């Protein structure tokens, strides 16, 4: 955040910069997650799947 | 709590040979010292179930060592139990 505007900065470029800053921050993902409750078993399963996928990606890259 | 000094005193008192640390008597004396020490803590914290397993392990080890000593030598076992007032 805190995207200050230059003297001649067009509004569109500032909007794009704010979009990029928000995307880098990742706040939207947390806000989406907070909507509903994830039970411990479901989150453990999701993390296991994510780890397996990451390891597969690393092995594919190394090849 | 028991410091290195107390342990050294116990070992010296029950040592049989010079530099002896592994004889049954020394091990039983050290275990008895620790078991007696832990009584105050377990009186203070009665729901610490995780450390009572270690306490029970010490008790079982003492029982095994005493049974071994009795089988090896009866007089030594009697003297050890008399000194420690165990049973």
């Amino acid at each position: 955040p805190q995207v200050k505007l230059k003297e001649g900065e067009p509004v569109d470029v500032a909007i794009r910069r704010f979009k990029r800053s928000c995307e880098k921050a990742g706040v939207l993902a947390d806000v989406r997650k907070r909507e509903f409750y994830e039970k411990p078993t479901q989150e453990r399963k999701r993390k296991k799947a994510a780890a397996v996928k990451r390891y597969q990606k690393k092995l594919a890259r190394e090849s | 709590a028991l410091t290195n000094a107390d342990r050294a005193e116990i070992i010296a008192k029950f040592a049989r040979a010079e530099n002896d640390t592994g004889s049954p008597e020394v091990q039983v004396a050290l275990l008895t010292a620790q078991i007696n020490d832990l009584q105050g803590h377990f009186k203070a914290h009665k729901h610490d179930h995780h450390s009572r397993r270690g306490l029970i392990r010490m008790v079982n080890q003492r029982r095994k060592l005493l049974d071994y000593l009795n089988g090896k030598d009866h007089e030594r076992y009697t003297a050890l139990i008399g000194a420690l007032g165990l049973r």
């Binding site: 200050k4 928000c22 706040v27 907070r34 509903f36 | -």
Partner: protein
């Protein structure tokens, strides 16, 4: 009556609705408007077009007090975050900065249950 040199814009963006509030620094609200306030009764309340229209109508009222420099705080995940800022730029206000203010709990209260449908 009051003359305010600089102002702040608040965007309560939601899936259902988008609310625009205009305030002056140190607090106090000068004017406000929402999608449902000017038509858009129903699902259109969520459309970004309603968001930009609401922002424009709010800005038009805000001009009455007299101000030329604005700051934007976007607080919500709803569609209309870009629409409101575009409208505020179009109406002629100078935006000093645009920031995000959406809250985040550090494991606070339990969120509601998931919707099975």
């Amino acid at each position: 009556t009051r003359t305010v040199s600089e102002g702040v814009a608040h965007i309560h963006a939601s899936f259902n609705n988008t609310i625009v509030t205009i305030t002056d620094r140190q607090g106090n609200a000068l004017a406000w408007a929402t999608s449902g306030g000017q038509g858009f009764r129903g699902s259109r309340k969520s459309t970004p077009f309603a968001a930009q229209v609401a922002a424009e109508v709010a800005g038009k009222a805000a001009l009455d007090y007299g101000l030329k420099n604005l700051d934007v705080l976007v607080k919500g995940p709803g569609p209309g975050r870009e629409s409101a800022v575009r409208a505020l730029g179009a109406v002629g206000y100078k935006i000093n900065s645009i920031t995000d203010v959406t809250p985040i709990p550090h494991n606070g209260c339990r969120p509601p249950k998931k919707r099975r449908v």
